Amino acid sequence: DLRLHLLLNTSVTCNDGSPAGYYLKESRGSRRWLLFLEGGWYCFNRENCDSRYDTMRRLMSSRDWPRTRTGTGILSSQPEENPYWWNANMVFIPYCSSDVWSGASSKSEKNEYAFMGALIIQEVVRELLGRGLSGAKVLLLAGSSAGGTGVLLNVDRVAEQLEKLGYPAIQVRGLADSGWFLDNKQYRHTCTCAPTEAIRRGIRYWNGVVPERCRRQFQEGEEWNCFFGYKVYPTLRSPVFVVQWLFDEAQLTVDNVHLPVQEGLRLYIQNLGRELRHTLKDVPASFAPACLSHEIIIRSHWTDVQVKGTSLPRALHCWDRSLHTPLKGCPVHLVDSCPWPHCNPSCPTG
Ligand SMILES: FC(F)(F)c1c(Cl)ccc(-n2ccnn2)c1Cl
Ligand SMILES: *[C@@H]1O[C@H](CO)[C@@H](O)[C@H](O)[C@H]1NC(C)=O
């Protein structure tokens, strides 16, 4: 249902210099726009990016992209699959920059790869304005995994971009799914590169950019801190809803945890969930189930998980209402308190 458009500005490119793009399904009677950032890890040096180019080329190039994609989960146009925003204008932005959506660097005589994630988002927004986005009332920038961190890094820049283009009435909001990570100690030490070390190397290789207020706090050489949700979120002005499994599989991977569990690992896992829960305590719009999993919002069965009896599509609807005092029976802060994966019976089965 979503049709591919390669960017008209062919200077905004995937890693290999092929044009970036977006998949679009318009909904002509709607002023809601959902722009979804795909995830898919990252690469932080020539050797690891070369390997990714061999066996994950669609994440580095548009040369082999299909002409259409089916919208699923929050990108579905069927109310049965998407109770939240089924009638919205739907945009899926493929992740082909390997930079957690942070890069602003072209391929050149000094750069084998272009890392243009931050510029891809800006260019998609610019080109959509002529396709109906100029009439929008709400632009929800959503994303999963690396795309979820991409929301945190870019939501306020989209807001600033629309303001400077003369569209102050479009309300820009963010939905960060599975992009809220902890710069914690690994369970066993290995660069499965530790989260702190991975981002420090990548940001230099990508010429990565972070939100301005966060950059002003951490300053030169320390911008890697702004890739961590609990540090960047308090600096953001746009409303951001945070979805994060308490025992996220990507978090455990970078922590070198691989799953009978003995005391040391049991304590490690329980402490991880408690730390994640703590970082969400003052995030008013959040959905954090006690599950071992990764991503949720574009899965066809994303409607199934509940926290305290409330599904994610319901919580997002309650968030919409809150952005028109708490709402009777329409909660927006939903964080599990039970301390072990699958202590929530609605967790994905696998
Ligand atoms: F390492 C880390 F720091 F925890 C981190 C960050 Cl900041 C942002 C995105 C990812 N990620 C996971 C899967 N795709 N991207 C990770 Cl794993
Ligand atoms: C194309 O994108 C580049 C990089 O974002 C930008 O500098 C340039 O102004 C863009 N060109 C047009 C015509 O928008």
Author numbering: 88 to 277, 279, 284 to 351, 355 to 419, 427 to 452
Q: How do the authors describe this structure?
A:
Exploration of the substituents on the aryl ring that binds in the palmitoleate pocket of Notum gave potent early lead 7y (IC50 9.5 nM) and further optimization of the triazole group delivered 8l (IC50 6.7 nM). So far, all changes to the C4 substituent had been unfavorable, then, somewhat unexpected, potent inhibition of Notum activity was entirely recovered by removal of the substituent as unsubstituted triazole 8l (IC50 6.7 nM) was the most potent inhibitor prepared in this series. The Notum-8l X-ray structure is consistent with the ligand retaining the H-bond between N3 of the triazole and the backbone of Trp128. In addition, 8l has near complete occupancy of the palmitoleate pocket through the 2-Cl-3-CF3-4-Cl substituents on the aryl ring. The near optimal filling of the pocket is achieved while still positioning the triazole in a favorable position for a hydrogen bond with the backbone of Trp128. This combination of features is likely why such high potency is observed. Triazole 8l restored Wnt signaling in the presence of Notum (EC50 110 nM) in a cell-based TCF/LEF reporter assay confirming functional activity. Assessment in broader off-target and safety pharmacology screens showed 8l to be selective against serine hydrolases, kinases, and representative drug targets. In summary, triazole 8l (ARUK3001185) is a potent and selective inhibitor of Notum activity with good brain penetration suitable for oral dosing in rodent models of disease.
